[PDB]
Amino acid sequence: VPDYASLRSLVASSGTLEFNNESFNWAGVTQNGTSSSCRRGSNSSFFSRLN
């Protein structure tokens, strides 16, 4: 991620991972994409916050 430290420092300063998820009518595309590198126990998965 470009300017990594800035995100770290801006997220650190906030001091909260509070998170609400919204809805984006992603028309005609496959959500919940998956990769074998991001294992979540048995099955493969992906980052929890990204689609």
Partner: protein, 50 residues
């Protein structure tokens, strides 16, 4: 002072002025010392830059 002639009081300007000369003298080292400077970096911010 108090003698047979009675009581009395008189100031000593010579040493009094010697105190003012040291005080007024430390004032002019501090009052009006200001050195001008300009275009310092922005010290306040509105957005999150990191």
């Amino acid at each position: 002072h108090q003698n047979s002639e009675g009581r009395g009081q008189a100031a000593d300007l010579k040493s009094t002025q010697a105190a003012i000369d040291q005080i007024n003298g430390k004032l002019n080292r501090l009052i009006g010392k200001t050195n001008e400077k300009f275009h310092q970096i922005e010290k306040e911010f509105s957005e999150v830059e990191g």
